[PDB]
Structure 1
Amino acid sequence: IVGGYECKAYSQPHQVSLNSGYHFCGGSLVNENWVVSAAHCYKSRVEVRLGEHNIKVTEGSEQFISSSRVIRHPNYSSYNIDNDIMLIKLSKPATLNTYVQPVALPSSCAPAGTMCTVSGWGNTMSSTADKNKLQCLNIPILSYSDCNNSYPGMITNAMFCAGYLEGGKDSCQGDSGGPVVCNGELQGVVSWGYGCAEPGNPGVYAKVCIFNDWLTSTMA
């Protein structure tokens, strides 16, 4: 997260870290057994780390649970990062407490201009911002035209841009798979972008509101 601030510890209880030796992606807990992430973060097996704030220091609030299933959306297209959503089933259920809680799925698609929150342990591109401590950033959903203007012909129905065209505030690699929460619902998943926080290149996110049927049926 570039241009954001350190989240208040455990203020994003649904946020998880995907780890197979080191942190490589984020994810969002949606119930005691499942995590929603980005399909480009796919790995056959991964350890999901919940209840984290500082991913380098053991705090006593964490739960490390290995995945039992990692399911990418069947229509995921890697060359254009389309339908970049994935479900991770925990081998054992997570204990819901003050540090670990699920985030609700969207009841509808949020309109452009809706202010949301994106978080993660990705690069901050700052000498004073510690990416090891969960970072938070408020970003507005951008219009389809601003999105397509930024990435001509590359925006699909499963995508939406959010952030600032002027640059300075955006998600980055490391945040991939992470949550974009708007009004208490998971509207997006950190997906892609050119560079990080670069003017004219806002973040692109997987639009969760169009995958409700696949998500619920898969977890059913």
Structure 2
Amino acid sequence: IVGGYTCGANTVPYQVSLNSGYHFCGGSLINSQWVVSAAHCYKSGIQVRLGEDNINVVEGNEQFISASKSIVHPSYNSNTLNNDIMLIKLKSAASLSRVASISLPTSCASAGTQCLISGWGNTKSSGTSYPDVLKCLKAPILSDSSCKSAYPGQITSNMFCAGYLEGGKDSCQGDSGGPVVCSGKLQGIVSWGSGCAQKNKPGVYTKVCNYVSWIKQTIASN
């Protein structure tokens, strides 16, 4: 997260870290046994870490649970990044104040809606600096029109832009798969962008409201 602020220990209880020997992606807990993240975060040997604040030191509120199953959306396209969504089943259910699930959306959010984006990703636009603690960012959902103007022929119906045209505030490497929560509902999954915090290049997110049916049914039959 570039241009954000320290969230505060366990103030984003649905935030998880995907660990493969180190933090490589984020994710959201939507069920005591299920996590949603990005399809490009697919990796074998994933360990999910819940109740985390400082990802570098054990603080006692953590629960490390390995994934028993990783289901990438059947129509994920690695070239176009369309349908960049994945469900991870925990080997055992998490014990749900510091660890809680986030609600799926009843409907899609509109341009202008303010959302909270969180993660342990790079905090520099020019450079590298990974935080120990979780970072937060409030960014508004942008219109489909401007999103498409920022990325000609790259935005699908399953993606939305959020951020600032001026630059300086954005998601970045290490944030992928993390939540974009608006009005208490999970509306997006951090996905991609041209660099980080660049002017006229807002971050692109997976539009969760379009997958609610697939998620609910997929969770129930696995």
TM-score, normalising length from structure 1? 0.97
- Matched AA of 1:175: D
Residue 206 (structure 1) aligns with: 206
Is the contact made by 2:33 and 2:94 (CA closer than 8 Å) also made in structure 1? yes
2:115 equivalent to 1:101: no
2:140 equivalent to 1:119: no
**Distance in 1 between residues matched to 2:90 and 2:182, nearest whole Å:** 25
Is the contact made by 2:32 and 2:95 (CA closer than 8 Å) also made in structure 1? yes
Q: Secondary structure of the residue that 1:161 maps to in structure 2?
A: strand
Residue 32 (structure 1) aligns with: 32
Is the contact made by 2:121 and 2:130 (CA closer than 8 Å) also made in structure 1? no
Q: Secondary structure of the residue that 1:217 maps to in structure 2?
A: helix
Residue 176 (structure 2) aligns with: 176
Q: Secondary structure of the residue that 1:30 maps to in structure 2?
A: strand
Residue 62 (structure 1) aligns with: 62
- Matched ranges for 1:106-185 at <5 A: 106-125=105-124, 131-185=131-185
- Matched AA of 2:139: I
Q: Secondary structure of the residue that 1:25 maps to in structure 2?
A: strand
Q: What is the CA-CA distance between 1:8 and the residue it aligns to?
A: 1.4
**Distance in 2 between residues matched to 1:102 and 1:182, nearest whole Å:** 14
- Matched AA of 2:156: T
- Matched AA of 1:125: K
- Matched ranges for 1:8-47 at <5 A: 8-47=8-47
* CA offsets 1:177-218 (integer angstroms, 9 cap, x no match): 000000000000000001000001100000000001110000
**Distance in 1 between residues matched to 2:132 and 2:83, nearest whole Å:** 28
Q: What is the CA-CA distance between 1:45 and the residue it aligns to?
A: 2.9
Is the contact made by 1:161 and 1:203 (CA closer than 8 Å) also made in structure 2? yes
Q: What is the CA-CA distance between 1:130 and the residue it aligns to?
A: 5.9
Q: What is the CA-CA distance between 1:44 and the residue it aligns to?
A: 2.7
- Counting matched residue pairs gives 218
**Distance in 2 between residues matched to 1:160 and 1:114, nearest whole Å:** 12
Q: What is the CA-CA distance between 1:80 and the residue it aligns to?
A: 1.3
- Matched ranges for 1:74-93 at <5 A: 74-93=74-93
Query: Which structure 1 residue ranges, 5 or more long, are not aligned?
Result: none
TM-score, normalising length from structure 2? 0.96
Is the contact made by 1:45 and 1:69 (CA closer than 8 Å) also made in structure 2? no
Is the contact made by 1:103 and 1:184 (CA closer than 8 Å) also made in structure 2? yes
* CA offsets 1:73-96 (integer angstroms, 9 cap, x no match): 001001111110100000000000
**Distance in 1 between residues matched to 2:55 and 2:80, nearest whole Å:** 30
